[PDB]
């Protein structure tokens, strides 16, 4: 965490800094998108 890294989340490619988030995803909710229709939040597949 806390560094610009390449990540593969459930087959989803990405590149960015992973930081702790204050969003409370619903139990079913998996991916988060911002106003500009881009992936901004993710839920770790192992630790909720």
């Amino acid at each position: 965490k806390n560094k610009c890294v390449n990540f593969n989340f459930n087959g989803l490619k990405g590149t960015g800094v992973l930081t702790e988030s204050n969003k409370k995803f619903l139990p079913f909710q998996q991916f988060g998108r911002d106003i500009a229709d881009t992936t901004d939040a993710v839920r770790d597949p192992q630790t909720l």
Partner: peptide, 23 residues
């Protein structure tokens, strides 16, 4: 008072003259 950002490439350059100088 009466008049009322993701950057995947777009940016908003600040104006050269601030509001104080215009005032």
């Amino acid at each position: 008072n009466k008049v009322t950002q993701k950057f995947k490439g777009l940016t908003v350059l600040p104006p050269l003259l601030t509001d104080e100088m215009i005032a």
